[PDB]
Amino acid sequence: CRIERLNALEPTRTVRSEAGVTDYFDEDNEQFRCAGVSTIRRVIEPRGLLLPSMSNAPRLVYIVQGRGIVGLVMPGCPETFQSFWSRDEHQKVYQFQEGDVLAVPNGFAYWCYNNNPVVAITVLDTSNDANQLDRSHRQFLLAGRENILRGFSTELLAAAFGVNMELARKLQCRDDTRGEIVRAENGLQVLRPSGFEETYCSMKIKQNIGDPRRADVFNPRGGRITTLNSEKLPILRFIQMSAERVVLYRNAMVSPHWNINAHSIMYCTGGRGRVEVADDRGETVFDGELRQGQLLIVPQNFAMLERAGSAGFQLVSIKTSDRAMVSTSALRGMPVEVLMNSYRLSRDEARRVKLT
């Protein structure tokens, strides 16, 4: 993580699937490497069901496109969803929407069903604290392929489940050829409507950040930002990650800054803009136009600047700390002569600098 030049990123292992495609971003990129994370962009056109797995790294998922339904399983917590002995029982379900962020902790089983094609981006802190495995991404697929039970032998596994050895193989999903997402032919109904678990079991898991009616900052000529973090999502006090949704208009520029306490992982959901970034050397490492569908990793302490083109700049900042922070009004706080002497400015230029 001593970088000469910044690149913009695009998935480097695309894998196709029955109800989607998996565009992996490869992490051996020194950028990703220095970042210490992975991201995975993945699409599930309708009826599609992504196979419940669990990942090495705790993960944030932002729903780039559309409504849907996601499912996460928290051990020791009782299935609070029932009908009618029983017709069905299962965990709580979460019906997500266009622009929610989803927080998945390690060794936890997520899955979601495409209730337009759902598009959503996902990052995994491979350098997180509770990834006591290696510094990589390990999905432990429960189903499909092998899935985790592959290495479990039928002989043992039947009595584990307490049933025939025939049925067990059908859980090995050996001949399965549909990957992480599947077509749900005959649809897929889950029980939707229309005690210690009141606390630890029922803690919120996604937040809709794209709601411009939720913005944190906002200029009408023009832009907006909102921050997702532990002050808004309790689970986030724990994931050591936080989210930013910056939407800028025509010729908007964000007050320059550097991230005090995190890297920043910039993915453009739309609009176009040049981004300029310089390192501690002062020399410029990055400088380029960013457009829809594109990834820039912008790290810690380094200095960043952006303005949208004539079409806009809609994006999503993921960072590596429970409340990541930028320092913009960085110079508006020094005494002016400090500015003067540090630059060789008269007063007026010092004051002009501080006051626009």
Add this chain to the structure above:
Amino acid sequence: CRIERLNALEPTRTVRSEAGVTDYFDEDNEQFRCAGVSTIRRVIEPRGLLLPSMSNAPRLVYIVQGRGIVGLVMPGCPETFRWSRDEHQKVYQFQEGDVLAVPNGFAYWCYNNGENPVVAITVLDTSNDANQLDRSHRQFLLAGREGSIKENILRGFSTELLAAAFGVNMERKLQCRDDTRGEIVRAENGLQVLRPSGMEEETYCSMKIKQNIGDPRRADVFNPRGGRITTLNSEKLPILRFIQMSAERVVLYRNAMVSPHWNINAHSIMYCTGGRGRVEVADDRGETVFDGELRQGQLLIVPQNFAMLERAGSAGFQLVSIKTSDRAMVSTVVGLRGMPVEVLMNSYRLSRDEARRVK
């Protein structure tokens, strides 16, 4: 706090402002007293505007009906929201079934930006650790104001001072000396602020302050035969960690009933937004203490450890339950099922097959 009876309780005291009504449940009410809370139903016509005022108590507020804005400002946090507009702190756009968290000495203005009227029932913890002073509701009116009518604060300051204090001309306006429109006045030609629609760091500041809980797609339980339960606590909204109030929204489909239970860490303040339904409550000495039907628009406080039982009607039953701790909890009797079988047989003298019939 040794009360003998529970009764459906209602705004004993009501006052229309100019753009809405305030429906005051009693303060020194035995229940409320031992409850250690104060509460209110407020209503706001469209265009109607609730006065700025900070309250002694942590306003947890529930927007039953209507939509709009509420503006809370966190002084010391930089206002975050040329042709024609000003600046000010971020403002908050509520909806039906929203929960709103307003602390103490925190300020909040409220405006009805369209549609129908807005009604929010409020709960104020008048005995919180933060409630210094005494156990009433103190509402420090920033603005405005037969019998004893309040005033805003600035009338308690001399003009020259005030004038000298603010550098505005010494020509009264601010004491709100003539006004009468109440804590809810109206903004006839609309009110515009800095809102998103167009079209064509902060840490302790960015915190969320509202969380929609009326939404069905959110409920945590579905179904205790047969409604749904949505539960707000610090595990969903991090401010509660400091307010030490919790919230339940609970819609019971017809015929239904919620399991017998008692609030471990909690007094419960429950009220009927709608539907029609029964509640049965008891105490230590064995006898019940509430055998009566709760209809919409009626308040009932269910206390700690008191075991309680409800049952919906055919028009359903839809209550809202606000509780007194950041993570308030109840014990689902059924959740009993943890005592050993002989422990069930010896206590009540039943044979085994009875024991399991309950477990």
Add this chain to the structure above:
Amino acid sequence: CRIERLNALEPTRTVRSEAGVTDYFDEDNEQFRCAGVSTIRRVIEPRGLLLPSMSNAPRLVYIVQGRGIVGLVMPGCPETFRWSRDEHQKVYQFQEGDVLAVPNGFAYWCYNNGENPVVAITVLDTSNDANQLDRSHRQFLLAGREGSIKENILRGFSTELLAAAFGVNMERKLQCRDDTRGEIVRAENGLQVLRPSGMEEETYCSMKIKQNIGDPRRADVFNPRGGRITTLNSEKLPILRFIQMSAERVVLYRNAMVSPHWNINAHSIMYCTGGRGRVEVADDRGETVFDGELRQGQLLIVPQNFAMLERAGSAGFQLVSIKTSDRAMVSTVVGLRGMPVEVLMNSYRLSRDEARRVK
């Protein structure tokens, strides 16, 4: 809480159930009052069984004599304990000198599984932060029941409801309507549960709830000439962190004495399990407030900052000290030895050699 005298205090009120006696120390007792606690001695014959009941207060319980089970259940935690047996939550096997932590609105049943009778003296914090409501002991009787005798809770619920609530036939048993055996009934042909002997995730659930403190091999101090002190606080049992009670078991060999000291962060509730010994206590205005001998089976509350002095007898002295905070502390006068020497000479007008004689 300006009390003038301390006296050895005893169960003013006693009641035999059917399988044991309850020995009630007063509630509104000045001491107890300003102490902000309630307490009890309970006794249980073999086979005897304490009723399920949750208490308003955090039951810290001390098993002086006997062994057995206590079953606490943490609702929401999955019961963790075919031919012939049921299921239920894990149960807890106590012994002499055990400390038992039972919260509020927490349920606990207690059974004497052999040997001699069992006697546990209980301390209930009736003014905890968790004690919502008022400052008495409220015991919510799950089961069973001249003057005002309590009942269990379910009698406060109508049958059909109840019946409809539970899906059991409408044929009374559960209100405990005829019963009389008291909160301690007996299980004549034994009681069997799911215990280990044979032979041939949970986080907030797995927490420990008891910790043996009577064991000598545990004491922390040996010896202040000449007994031993074992000390239970959140640094040994993590629940206390939430109960905010602490515990001292202190066996004084004959002739001995414990250093003069006062409870910093603590009221002390001390009681004589055995032995024979003296206690001297004082306050602010200088004069003593307890000059008297404490024999076995007698309670004395030693308050905060009050400085205290004890001395064993020849039959020894063996007390148990339960205190009111998760980490309650005392100041060993000797631990004085930190004031500078001249600071000792000027205060009491002594020459240096006196000063050091104390230090």
Add this chain to the structure above:
Amino acid sequence: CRIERLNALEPTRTVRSEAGVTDYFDEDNEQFRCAGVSTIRRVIEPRGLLLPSMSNAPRLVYIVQGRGIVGLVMPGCPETFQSFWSRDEHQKVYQFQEGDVLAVPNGFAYWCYNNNPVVAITVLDTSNDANQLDRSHRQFLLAGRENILRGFSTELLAAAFGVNMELARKLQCRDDTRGEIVRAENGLQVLRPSGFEETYCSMKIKQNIGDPRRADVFNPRGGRITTLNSEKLPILRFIQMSAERVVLYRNAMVSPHWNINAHSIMYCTGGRGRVEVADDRGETVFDGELRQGQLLIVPQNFAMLERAGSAGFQLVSIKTSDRAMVSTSALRGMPVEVLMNSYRLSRDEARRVKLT
């Protein structure tokens, strides 16, 4: 820590001693390596005294066999044990027993005296947080050999202690030839009976986990488990480790699972059983019988299964987090059609799966 195959482990440096033997487990094993710990099995037949040292890594010790007496020294804490100026004074002592767990934090001086031969196993989180030294095991022996004072010169050290230079050498233990444990010829009496320190100084240090009267889970046909962690041992909120004691009967099988938030370090104290373990690849990495006296490292997220032979399976799980967790009732919480579609099962097989 990208493993192809799991092995079962056996100490790799056995060193003999006057009152015992030290069977070290060598940590350059990629398993141990990926684990990031060390373990040391060590025996002290009676009268034996193990030399007070301090270790790099904070350590958990489980007393496999027998009662005894252990001693730990907490700086700044006053010797609360006295007699009679004085005859003796010293720290509190802890008389341990068959099956206690002992928690030793870093840079802290433990020692114990064999009051049957005492057998006890010890693990050291070499990757812990406060091991700011290298990623290895460093015992800093106070006595014996050299011991820590070896490099201290007599000339300086005497006046340090404030005594003759003759006596100092006898603390160098130069000619000492008895290692970490010693025979206590003339026995060894320590004062046993038969204020800010009431808190920070007196926090409990061992727990008896083997007490089947302490089990957390229990089936009478048959098995039991108990968990030792910060909810039972306060010190454990700090050591970033927790303990599990699983005892299974005839043909008992533990509900499969993976450790969410830790590795698991399986040592068999008795009984025999096959253990089956598979990685994220699904492929099987482990599969083998485990018997008394044997070590298996089972990591994070990976999936494990075991049943005892006809003789039993008694063991002790040490894991690397203050409250390590497994996720078993992992599938009993998905909605059934999820299971169906993820495996291609009708309902009945889905429901049979969930309900046995």
Add this chain to the structure above:
Amino acid sequence: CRIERLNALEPTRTVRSEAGVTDYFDEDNEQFRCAGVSTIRRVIEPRGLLLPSMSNAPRLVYIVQGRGIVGLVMPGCPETFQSFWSRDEHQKVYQFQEGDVLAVPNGFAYWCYNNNPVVAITVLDTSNDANQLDRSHRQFLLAGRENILRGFSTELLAAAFGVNMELARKLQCRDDTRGEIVRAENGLQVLRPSGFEETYCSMKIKQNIGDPRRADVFNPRGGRITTLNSEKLPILRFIQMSAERVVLYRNAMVSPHWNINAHSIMYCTGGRGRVEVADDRGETVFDGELRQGQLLIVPQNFAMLERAGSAGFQLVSIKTSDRAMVSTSALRGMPVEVLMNSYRLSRDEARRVKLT
């Protein structure tokens, strides 16, 4: 960080400056390396102004010599210093003195002005938690050289600031040839006298540790010590570092010890003394006289001993934990026979050992 021998350290990259000189300590020294920090000794003779930068690592600065004035900028916090629209406004300023410690967190902008030549030493935990960049020292100079804005292009930057492209270049400080510190010709007045920010914004930042009227320990024949840490400086609960000021007189020796929970970074401000240090091997790694102006790194768990020469030994211990600790009264707490048998001592030598 497996060391054979300890060296004493002296800056290895000295760089000269208009109002000072920068004597860098180079961290690729395995000592520094194993330490995982950097230190920088830097002088600012009067009128001098060191350029506001921000460093990779959070930093402690101890003012070896003289009074002065330091300035630190905390984003989101309003300039609480004003005059008179406005004549000047800026952050709070801190007028430091001979022997204060200064705590600078990452991605935060410090600077100070020489109000005798000011001398002060600075350490940077390069291995800290929120240095998510590499394991090195990155100063991000705001001004001077390039400074952070170098890589920012004039074209963009003017409208960023909202002003001419002429003035912007003068912020690039391209032709600047005065480095990190500058002469303040025409002096440098800053507004000195003679709400959520009452808490998070106003938390103390320096403490005067050299005040012998502040010592923690003290023998009049002779020595003194004081500890600076989170019990005295709240910010220090966060920096994961703490400070010790040991002053010893004629022939003073400090009670031997090892640091339980940190390394120790010894810099001599004066006086002279031999220091003796041994590793876990027992063998001696260090042994040498330390004099004014000299650095010794003394790590974790290792054992240390020092006495002053006839001139004294004044120094400053910086360590890597919010409340670093030493264990001295390490043997005064074992039972005596333990000592006896562990060394082969009679009673008297055991008791003599414990009682002097």
